[PDB]
Amino acid sequence: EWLQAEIARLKGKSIVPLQQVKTLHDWLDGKRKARKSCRVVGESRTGKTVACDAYRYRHKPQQEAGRPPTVPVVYIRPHQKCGPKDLFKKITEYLKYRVTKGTVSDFRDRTIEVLKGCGV
DNA sequence: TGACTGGTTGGCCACTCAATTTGCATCTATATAGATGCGCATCTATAT
Ligand SMILES: Nc1ncnc2c1ncn2[C@@H]1O[C@H](COP(=O)(O)OP(=O)(O)OP(=O)(O)O)[C@@H](O)[C@H]1O
Ligand SMILES: [Mg+2]
């Protein structure tokens, strides 16, 4: 009946535009055009991760039949005590590059090489 | 006639994690010797 779907809208997650989200998207675009690194800080329930999701979605990948894709924005949440091989594995996986095994020095070189040409 | 011979169905390196030692900084809750102040005795002086 009608009552059963309604848990799902409620339980279901959604994104609501808010002033705080808009503020970040414009600031990040300044940083992205300028190629300036920066940090975002704030308390854990302010919804930082969600604003960053909403930002990622506004810039879809472009894919041709043969050559590899353009992807402007990469988002990763490291695991606790994330080491070098674990960081390179996450950058590599968010792009779905097929190679999965390697020495730390091999993943380092391979990560630099997939950020290049892919146009991040 | 009793001999001879032939017959024949894991290793070499690079990286990571639980641990467990050692050292340092920060309470903390008690233990312990010195000022300070009444509370009365004791002496001295003064007056009728
Ligand atoms: N723009 C938004 N629209 C709708 N809901 C939002 C928005 N921003 C945050 N929320 C709500 O915040 C909750 C999740 O918080 P979120 O994970 O965004 O916080 P956070 O600050 O990124 O957390 P942390 O820093 O601890 O990782 C959800 O209930 C989600 O609906
Ligand atoms: Mg977050």
Side-chain angles (χ1 to χ4, degrees), chain A residues 76-82 86-87 90:
Chain A
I76 55 163
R77 188 187 79 267
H79 298 305
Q80 185 56 296
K81 297 175 185 285
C82 180
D86 311 326
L87 181 66
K90 280 192 175 290

Side-chain angles (χ1 to χ4, degrees), chain A residues 58-73:
Chain A
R58 291 181 59 184
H59 325 272
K60 188 186 176 181
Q62 305 272 335
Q63 180 66 81
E64 295 85 357
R67 40 183 170 216
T70 294
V71 188
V73 185

Side-chain angles (χ1 to χ4, degrees), chain A residues 20-83:
Chain A
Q20 193 78 70
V21 175
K22 175 62 152 53
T23 298
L24 179 63
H25 286 200
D26 290 342
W27 181 77
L28 290 184
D29 200 72
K31 303 303 172 196
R32 187 174 59 93
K33 292 181 181 179
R35 298 297 201 273
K36 299 297 174 269
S37 295
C38 62
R39 77 181 195 288
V40 177
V41 288
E43 199 279 324
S44 70
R45 297 284 72 182
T46 57
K48 297 193 303 284
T49 279
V50 172
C52 298
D53 283 348
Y55 189 60
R56 173 180 67 254
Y57 286 122
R58 291 181 59 184
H59 325 272
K60 188 186 176 181
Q62 305 272 335
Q63 180 66 81
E64 295 85 357
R67 40 183 170 216
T70 294
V71 188
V73 185
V74 173
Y75 177 87
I76 55 163
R77 188 187 79 267
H79 298 305
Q80 185 56 296
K81 297 175 185 285
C82 180

Side-chain angles (χ1 to χ4, degrees), chain A residues 74 76 87-95 111 114-115:
Chain A
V74 173
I76 55 163
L87 181 66
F88 298 143
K89 185 176 181 289
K90 280 192 175 290
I91 296 165
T92 302
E93 281 179 9
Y94 172 92
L95 299 176
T111 297
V114 299
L115 290 173

Side-chain angles (χ1 to χ4, degrees), chain A residues 1-12:
Chain A
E1 293 177 350
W2 164 101
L3 294 174
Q4 183 64 243
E6 295 302 320
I7 297 169
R9 294 183 181 277
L10 294 174
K11 183 178 179 180

